[PDB]
Design a protein around this ligand. Structure first.
Ligand SMILES: [Ca+2]
Ligand code: NA
Lengths: 253, 377, 45
């Protein structure tokens, strides 16, 4: 995260850390949507152009964490993946559309003060919350700057405003799609901030003023640098892909 | 044995020749085809006998006979249109006109080394030079064309002329974008810095680095060609205060292999000078050092399997001309698409702004097609 | 109030109570910058 601040303890209990076995390193962010299901970005574990394809066995998920490196026993909870299900429509070639993956946990993770699942928006909720002008919350252990400590000591957080499609689109030569939205501050607003290397897969969340609950409206996908003036972070439009998520959940359960 | 271990022997010989030339001219640009040299020695060995053949055999470490097949297969694969990238190679041996050449010599040469052997009246210098310079121009698609002058091939005192020419310029698996090709500072040998055009690209390349027997460190990167069989290797001293001459002598095919088992992929800003290297080499003196002195002796040279009669035949001129161009042209943007995006954060650099040596390597065979040092692009 | 949704047998336990945080919501406590998110819906910018 860029231009963010330290997350409070139990501020983002659904936050998940995608950790690689060997070597031992941070891979991406991710979110906990239930007892055994974790959500993340596709490209975090499938990118041919770099020869990257991990497997349930290459990977580990760390839940309830706060520190980026310290081992938090009795707090965090590491779990393994029974299976990986990434979206077949995942356009890894040109624009990274459908940047999304599920990952099932071999054993159901127990909930506590540091581990709780986030809600997924329904038609009405997605319609009510996902609008240009509203702000969302981004979180991750990604780098503090695009170019330049560099890595955060503890989970980072930042709030960003959802941007107008026409604007997002006239911001990059890349071919946007209805499956992705972009957020971030315009150059003439003062406040800045963005996701960055390592933040991918992380959740973009919003809180319902109606029922006091938190919803994941996006997945950190891609951007042209970090905290660039005139640039914006692009996030996977979750709901617009909820059908697939339901199919997999019930089918490959 | 293994056609790989054999190619190893050939390439080694060429490299040893490279080391020789390099030490005698440290600050100059030198491009050689190690494998090409092995082919020339083969061409020669085919029609040589007695002491002459004995010398060639003990240097090459292998005898043309009983191996030709292995040598023909490798020499065929290298040029094979299956590489997608085309390596033009010309091989010719010219013999005095007033001498009847043998049939099996001509036949075998064209068969194993794709070499054209034929007569030419050296009695007339200008006529021979044009005749030869014209064959190279044709055999290399106008790529190379100026091996001999008129003041070189002179009189009937010139009996035998060997020639090997190699040209190359494949297509990068990851083309450079001209928009990103700007002039960057290059520090030459003398110490002076020059402003020189340089290719620049952000992508994943195999990298690495180790120390020489003298504990001096150098880096090396692999730049594969869209063909997927021929790749370019670049190595240069890690410390700016380290002379290239301090790493060269410690490099054999054996070390080139280590490179292959050591290098790992990593996202990098690879910046290397855009240049076109072309050098002509006289292999006479270097080859003498290796122990091959007979064939250069008007009387001692024994080439019986070359001539129908017992005429005295010796090597008057043995030459190689290698040409390579490094440019932007290559395959395009499919992995280049999003690959441009995931560069979320400036990556490390592989900047070649100091005298460096390069390799063109045919992976399947292990054949080292090119070996060069660039002191000033 | 939440619904439905998803089958708890194949989805796992959680959804029902999803969105609520033990150390904040389940304790009538607000995190430092969450008001910003709320105030966002009606700030006119
Ligand atoms: Ca607003
Ligand atoms: Na920005």
């Amino acid at each position: 995260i860029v231009e963010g601040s330290d997350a409070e303890i139990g501020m983002s209990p659904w936050q998940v850390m995608l950790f690689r076995k060997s070597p031992q390193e941070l891979l991406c962010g991710a979110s906990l949507i239930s007892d055994r299901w974790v959500l993340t970005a596709a490209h975090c574990l499938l990118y041919p152009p770099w020869d990257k394809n991990f497997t349930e066995n290459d990977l580990l998920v760390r839940i309830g964490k706060h520190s980026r490196t310290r081992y938090e026993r009795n707090i965090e909870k590491i779990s393994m993946l029974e299976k990986i299900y990434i979206h077949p429509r995942y356009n890894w070639r040109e624009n990274l559309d459908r940047d999304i993956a599920l990952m099932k946990l071999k054993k159901p993770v127990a909930f506590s003060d540091y581990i709780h699942p986030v809600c997924l928006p329904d038609r009405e909720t997605a319609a009510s919350l996902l609008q240009a002008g509203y702000k969302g919350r981004v979180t991750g252990w990604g780098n503090l700057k695009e170019t330049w400590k560099g890595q955060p000591s503890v989970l980072q957080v930042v709030n960003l405003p959802i941007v107008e499609r026409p604007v997002c689109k006239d911001s990059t030569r890349i071919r946007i799609t209805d499956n992705m939205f972009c957020a971030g501050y315009k150059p003439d607003e003062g406040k800045r901030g963005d996701a960055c290397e390592g933040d991918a897969g992380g959740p973009f969340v919003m809180k319902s003023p109606f029922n006091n609950r938190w919803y994941q409206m996006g997945i950190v996908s891609w951007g042209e640098g970090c905290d660039r003036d005139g640039k914006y972070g692009f996030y996977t439009h979750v709901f617009r892909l909820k059908k697939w998520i339901q199919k997999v959940i019930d089918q490959f359960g | 044995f293994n056609p790989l271990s054999l190619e190893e022997l050939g390439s080694n010989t060429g490299i040893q020749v490279f080391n020789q030339i390099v030490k005698s001219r440290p600050h100059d640009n030198i491009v050689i085809s190690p494998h090409g040299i092995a082919s020339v020695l083969g061409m020669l060995q085919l029609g040589a006998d007695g002491r002459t053949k004995k010398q060639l055999a003990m240097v090459m470490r292998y005898g043309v006979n009983g191996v030709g097949k292995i040598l023909k297969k490798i020499n065929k694969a290298i040029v094979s249109k299956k590489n997608k990238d085309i390596v033009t190679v010309a091989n010719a041996v010219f013999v005095k006109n007033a001498s009847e050449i043998e049939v099996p010599f001509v036949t075998r040469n064209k068969d194993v080394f794709q070499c054209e052997v034929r007569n030419v009246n050296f009695e007339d210098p200008a006529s021979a030079c044009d005749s030869i310079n014209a064959w190279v121009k044709n055999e290399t698609r106008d790529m190379i064309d100026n091996l001999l002058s008129p003041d070189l091939i002179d009189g009937v005192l010139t009996r035998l002329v060997l020639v090997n020419a190699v040209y190359f310029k494949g297509l990068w698996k990851s083309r450079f974008q001209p928009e990103n090709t700007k002039k960057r500072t290059f520090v030459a040998a003398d110490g002076k810095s020059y402003q020189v055009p340089m290719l620049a690209q952000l992508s994943v390349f195999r990298c690495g680095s180790t120390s020489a027997p003298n504990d001096l460190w150098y880096n090396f990167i692999e730049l594969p060609y869209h063909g997927e069989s021929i790749s370019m290797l670049i190595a240069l001293p890690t410390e700016s205060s380290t002379p290239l001459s301090a790493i060269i002598p410690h490099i054999s095919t054996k070390t080139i292999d280590s490179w292959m088992s050591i290098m790992v992929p990593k996202r990098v800003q690879v910046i290397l000078p855009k240049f076109t290297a072309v050098a002509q080499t006289d292999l006479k003196e270097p080859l003498k050092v290796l122990g091959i002195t007979d064939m250069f002796d008007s009387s001692k040279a024994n080439f019986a399997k070359i001539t129908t009669g017992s005429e005295n035949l010796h090597v008057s001129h043995i030459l190689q001309k290698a040409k390579i161009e490094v440019s932007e042209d290559g395959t395009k943007a499919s992995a280049a698409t999003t690959a441009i995006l995931i560069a979320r954060s400036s990556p490390p650099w592989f900047i070649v702004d100091r005298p460096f040596l390069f390799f063109i390597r045919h992976n399947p065979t292990g054949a080292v097609l090119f070996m060069g040092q660039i002191n000033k692009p | 109030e939440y619904q439905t949704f998803f089958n708890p047998r194949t989805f796992g336990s959680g959804e029902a109570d999803c969105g609520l945080r033990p150390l904040f919501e389940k304790k009538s406590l607000e995190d430092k910058t969450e008001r910003e998110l709320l105030e966002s819906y009606i700030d006119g910018r």
